[PDB]
Amino acid sequence: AFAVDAAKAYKDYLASGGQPITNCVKMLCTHTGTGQAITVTPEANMDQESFGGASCCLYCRCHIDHPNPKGFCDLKGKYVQIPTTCANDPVGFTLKNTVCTVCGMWKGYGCSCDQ
Amino acid sequence: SSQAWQPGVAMPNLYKMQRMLLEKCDLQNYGDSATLPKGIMMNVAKYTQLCQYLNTLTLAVPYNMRVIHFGAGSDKGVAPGTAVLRQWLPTGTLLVDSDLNDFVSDADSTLIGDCATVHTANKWDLIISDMYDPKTKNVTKENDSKEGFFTYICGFIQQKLALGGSVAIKITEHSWNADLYKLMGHFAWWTAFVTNVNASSSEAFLIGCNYLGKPREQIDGYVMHANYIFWRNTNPIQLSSYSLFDMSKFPLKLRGTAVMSLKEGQINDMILSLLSKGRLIIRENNRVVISSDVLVNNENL
Ligand SMILES: CSC[C@H]1O[C@@H](n2cnc3c(N)ncnc32)[C@H](O)[C@@H]1O
Ligand SMILES: [Zn+2]
Ligand SMILES: [Zn+2]
C-alpha cells in the first residue's frame, strides 16, 4: 500500500518556495522546430527551449522507479520542449503538464485542438 | 583569423611533421573563458563544436550505426555530451555510454564502472571518449605517457572498432598516451582538434578518421605529443562561441554507408581505398550486446 509520492513532494517543495531542480541539459538548436512537446530531436520554436529528456524527468533525476507499470520513461532518450517562460524549472513543467495525444503539443502551451 | 567562425582549430599538418622535444604547455590566453550562449553548459558547447568539426570529415555513417561514448558522466549526475551526440547522430543510431560514476543519460544503454570492466560482443562505428582524471594536471611532476584508461582505449580500438570507423579521444597536456598517437597512424587520416569554446585549455580531441586496422604511417607518439604541445604553445587560439549560433546544418547526414562482413584475406587495396574514403564499414551486423565486469566482495566478519 505504501509507495513514495515523489511528484507530490516536488510540487509541495516548489509551492513552499524550494529552488527548482537544476542542471537540466539545454540543447543548442535553430529554434525553428515544430514546437511539439517530446521529440526524437530538438524541436524548439522561437518561444521554447529544447532539453535532453532524461535530465528533465523527475524519476530519472531522483533515481526512483517510474510510475509506468513497465517502468518505461516518456522522456529518456528524447528531447523535451519547454516554454521559455517556464525554462527555469523543466522538471516541474513536464511533471505538471500533459501532451495532447492528437497533435503532440503541450495542452495549454501549443495545443489548439479546442478550437 | 576566420578561425573564430569555425567550430575549432585542427592541428596544421606541418606541425605533425616536426620532431620537437616535449616542453611545458603555457597558453597565452590561459584562464580566459568563452562567453557561452545563455543557459548553455560548457560541455554542450564543447560537444557541439566537436560534432560540427566531425561533420567536415569522411565519417562512415551506416544504417544501424553503433556509437559508444566513454567518460559520459558529469559531476552533476547528467550526461550533456551524450545528449549532444544523440542529437547529432541519425535517429535510430545505437548509442551506449559509460562512466566511473553514476549519472542519468539519454543513451540507449549506460554502464557504470571503470572503463576497463566494459566488454562488448559487437564492433563499433564510432568511439568517443571524454575520459579524464584531473589529478594528471600536476605541473610539479614530469609529463610521461599515461596508461590506465588509455591502455584500455588502445586495446578497445584494435579489438572492437570496425574497419572504416572513427574515434575522437580527449587528451590534454598531461592526459595523453604515446601508443594512442601511434594508433592514429592506423587510420586513413588523423588530427588533434581544439574546440573554440575551450581554446584556453590544453585539451584536444585526438581524431582518427576511417580505421584501417594496420599502420599506414609509423608515428612516434612521444614526439607527436611534443609536436602537439609545440603547436599549442606557439598558436594562441581566440576563444569563440560563434559557431554555436548556426545549428542549421548540424545533424550528421545518414549516408547509408555499406556494411560488409569480410575476412582478413579479402581486404585488398580496393577495399582499403573504399575504407579510406568513408565509403565502407567492415564488421558483422549482429545484435549489440554489452556488459560490465563486477568485482564481488563480502566484507562481513
Ligand atoms: C566528463 S569529465 C571526465 C570523466 O571521465 C570519467 N573517467 C575518468 N577515468 C575513468 C575511468 N578509468 N573509467 C571510466 N570513466 C572514467 C570520470 O568519471 C569523468 O566523469
Ligand atoms: Zn525518466
Ligand atoms: Zn492537440
Author numbering:
A (entry chain B): 4271 to 4385
B (entry chain A): 6799 to 7099
Paper passage:
Non-structural protein 10 (nsp10) and non-structural protein 16 (nsp16) are part of the RNA synthesis complex, which is crucial for the replication of severe acute respiratory syndrome coronavirus 2 (SARS-CoV-2). Nsp16 exhibits 2’-*O*-methyltransferase activity during viral messenger RNA capping and is active in a heterodimeric complex with enzymatically inactive nsp10. It belongs to the class I methyltransferases and contains a Rossmann-fold, typical for methyltransferases, to bind SAM as the methyl donor and ^m7^GpppN-RNA (Cap0-RNA) as the methyl acceptor. The large active site of nsp16 can be divided into two main parts, the SAM and the Cap0 site ([Fig fig1]) which previously have been termed the low-affinity binding site (LBS) and high-affinity binding site (HBS), respectively.
Adenosine, 5’-methylthioadenosine (MTA), and tubercidin are structurally similar ([Fig fig2]) and electron density is observed in the adenosine cavity while SAM is fully replaced. The active site interactions are identical to those of the adenosyl moiety of SAM where the following protein and ligand atoms are within hydrogen-bonding (H-bonding) distances: Asp6912 carboxyl oxygen and exocyclic nitrogen at *C*6; Cys6913 backbone nitrogen and *N*1; the carboxyl oxygens of Asp6897 and both ribose hydroxyl groups; Tyr6930 backbone nitrogen with cyclic oxygen of the ribose ([Fig fig3]). Additionally, the backbone carbonyl oxygen of Tyr6930 is within H-bonding distance to the 5’-OH of tubercidin, adenosine and MTA. These hydroxyl groups show alternative conformations modeled with almost equal occupancies either in the ‘up’ (in close proximity to Tyr6930, occupancy: 40 %) or in the ‘down’ position (occupancy: 60 %) with the oxygen at the same position as the sulfur atom in SAM ([Fig fig3]). Glycine binds to the methionyl cavity which is occupied by an ethylene glycol in the structure with MTA alone.
